[PDB]
């Protein structure tokens with residue numbers, strides 16, 4: 570019922586203004602349009618503020634005044650650096666892996682604009698599900714920029730998320746290869762927003778969080794999962810993996826969270842760093858139809874009949890990221906609108922066609938205990954969280970999932 574997608578001319582220009590990603594958003598958008606999926610999707614234009622003060626209020630709802638001012642100064646100055654300017658940019662980590670360029674603030678803000686527009690569309694009940702491939706930056710902190718993430722659109726969108734109903738709870742699920750540290754930290758003390766991440770964790774791997782907590786004692790390391798009343802609310806799955814193993818690792822956890830928490834809204838990060846074709850070469854996820862962990866997770870999330878917001882994020886293989894996200898968009902249309910879509914395995918000729926070689930197939934050119942202990946730990950954590958928040962559940966079906 571009226572799936573949503575976020576795109577616009579200025580949105581296209583500014584989302585494709587990052588030297589790291591280049592024209593990834595342009596390729597993704599052109600691949601959705603080339604398969605004639607745009608007429609099956611409702612346009613959600615990015616949200617604009619009537620005054621710069623309103624934008625400041627919206628952004629600083631999570632971030633700090635000094636950080637936003639420093640990012641604006643970086644954008645202004647890049648359009649040499651003084652010693653004090655270098656010092657201030659280093660203090661906020663506005664360099665190194667987050668380099669400056671003339672459109673840092675504009676692009677980082679456009680991502681938040683799209684995410685907040687999707688949030689408003691979900692709240693107003695205009696769209697059952699809204700999609701935004703220009704956002705999904707889960708590494709941005711209050712007073713820090715990490716992993717080319719300057720503004721955390723996810724945190725602000727979740728915060729923005731009335732009928733009589735009752736207390737509102739939002740379930741965040743992160744499928745990026747890297748840990749959702751920013752969203753977890755933002756809602757570390759909040760039980761209403763339940764943050765879950767599935768990621769790779771190895772020593773020296775960015776960021777190194779979402780795994781066993783290293784402390785100074787002889788006891789075995791444990792998993793930190795919140796504080797105060799937001800304790801036991803942060804869930805993380807660190808994995809050392811193919812589509813089937815990833816699907817079996819994710820399924821029971823997300824089903825248990827949906828059953829227990831009973832959230833009003835769901836927000837999914839679909840960063841494409843887990844693809845086997847990704848240059849990082851960590852996980853072995855694909856985009857294949859016959860039954861891909863991405864598609865399985867998305868379908869199982871959509872099966873809950875809960876309003877959902879899908880975001881992009883990580884991914885360096887722009888054509889294959891576009892293939893994955895186009896398949897995800899088509900499957901969302903099929904699941905929500907109830908209208909099947911027959912995606913042509915041969916990629917239609919379009920603008921960026923030349924970059925989808927050399928086989929020009931929709932499927933990507935790739936030819937293909939820890940988990941049970943993790944399952945038990947997350948099951949106990951979910952039990953503790955449910956008892957802490959006094960949630961009603963049978964404690965029998967959830968065990969049967971595992």
Ligand SMILES: O=C(NO)c1ccc(Cn2c3c(c4cc(Br)ccc42)S[C@@H](c2ccccc2)C3)s1
Nearest residue numbers: 589665666667716717718747775840882883884
């Ligand atoms: O957006 C992301 N996930 O969603 C990211 C994951 C990793 C990131 C951070 N990073 C890294 C490189 C790099 C080159 C530019 Br230009 C800008 C940022 C960069 S090479 C590597 C590296 C960094 C530091 C030292 C050695 C190698 C990791 S961005």
Ligand SMILES: [K+]
Nearest residue numbers: 743745767768
């Ligand atoms: K993740």
Ligand SMILES: [K+]
Nearest residue numbers: 756762764802
């Ligand atoms: K939390």
Ligand SMILES: [Zn+2]
Nearest residue numbers: 745747842883
């Ligand atoms: Zn990533």
